[PDB]
Amino acid sequence: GGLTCASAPQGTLRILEGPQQSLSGSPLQPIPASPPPQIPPGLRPRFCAFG
């Protein structure tokens, strides 16, 4: 009436919960790159010679 060893298991199942990968879009930056410093339009000379 006691507990005895039974037949060895024939296989093992290991369960884990996993989600999946999306598409590669690689959206690097809101406003991207190093935007260049640049000329103010027209500007004009702010200096003249004497005479």
Partner 1 sequence: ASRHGQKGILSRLWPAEDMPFTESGMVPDILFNPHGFPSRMTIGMLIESMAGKSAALHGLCHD
Site for partner 1 in 18-37 (CB under 8 A): 37
Please give the helix or strand (H or E) that residue 1 lies within, else none.
none
CA dihedral angle for residue 22, residue 26, residue 27, residue 33, rounded to 10 degrees: 170
Contact status: 40 vs partner 1 (CB under 8 A): yes
Contact status: 46 vs partner 1 (CB under 8 A): yes
Task: List the one residue from 12, 16, 47, 51 that touches partner 1 (CB under 8 A).
Answer: 47
Binding site for partner 1 (CB under 8 A): 37, 40, 43, 46-47, 49-50
